[PDB]
Amino acid sequence: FERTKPHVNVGTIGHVDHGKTTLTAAITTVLAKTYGITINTSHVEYDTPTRHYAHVDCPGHADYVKNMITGAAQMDGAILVVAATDGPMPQTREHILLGRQVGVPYIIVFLNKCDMVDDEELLELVEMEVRELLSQYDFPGDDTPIVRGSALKALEGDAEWEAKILELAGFLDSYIP
Numbered sequence: 001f002e003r004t005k006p007h008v009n010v011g012t013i014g015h016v017d018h019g020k021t022t023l024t025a026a027i028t029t030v031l032a033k034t035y036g037i038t039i040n041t042s043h044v045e046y047d048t049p050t051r052h053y054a055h056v057d058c059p060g061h062a063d064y065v066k067n068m069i070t071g072a073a074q075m076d077g078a079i080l081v082v083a084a085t086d087g088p089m090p091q092t093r094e095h096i097l098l099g100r101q102v103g104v105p106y107i108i109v110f111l112n113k114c115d116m117v118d119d120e121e122l123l124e125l126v127e128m129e130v131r132e133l134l135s136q137y138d139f140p141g142d143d144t145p146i147v148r149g150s151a152l153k154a155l156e157g158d159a160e161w162e163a164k165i166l167e168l169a170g171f172l173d174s175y176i177p
């Protein structure tokens with residue numbers, strides 16, 4: 001465990017537009033500064049000072065469903081992007097169940113479109129309805145980290161937004177046993 005230092009494969013589940021691919025990109029970049037069948041799959045490896053991460057993001061639902069259903073991925077940690085602009089839409093609900101069956105123990109939720117969402121009243125509201133799916137279908141939903149940034153900003157520059165990706169990394173290290 002000491003070389004890898006604990007090696008963690010963290011699984012990113014969206015609907016179609018939320019920014020996972022984006023979320024996925026941002027995390028690495030942030031990470032670099034601060035520290036440093038047919039199957040279709042996209043892979044990134046990332047490191048916090050504690051854990052080391054392998055990350056999988058799939059261009060499509062079809063991918064998530066097949067990839068999650070067989071064996072592709074193995075996903076200890078599932079990082080979830082629900083985007084404020086919309087709300088949790090089908091692909092998110094589906095992804096949540098599928099996860100439960102899959103045996104995806106931990107889903108950590110990240111809320112993207114806060115480059116576009118001014119409204120504590122909405123956010124709570126995106127944020128509540130997530131909590132509501134998570135439970136009905138699987139998960140705690142209470143004692144479950146919800147992180148709001150905006151991935152797009154974070155790469156792109158400087159920012160407060162960047163900082164949040166840091167919580168995401170942080171929770172990861174914590175939330176995931």
Ligand SMILES: Nc1nc2c(ncn2[C@@H]2O[C@H](COP(=O)(O)OP(=O)(O)O)[C@@H](O)[C@H]2O)c(=O)[nH]1
Pocket residue numbers: 014015016017018019020021022023112113114115116149150151152153
């Ligand atoms: N404004 C804004 N747009 C975003 C953000 N993240 C992603 N997008 C944009 O929305 C489009 C779809 O996002 P994407 O990451 O590809 O979604 P995915 O299908 O879940 O992988 C992208 O081309 C991005 O330019 C974000 O945090 N803010």
Ligand SMILES: [Mg+2]
Pocket residue numbers: 020021057058059060
């Ligand atoms: Mg994608």
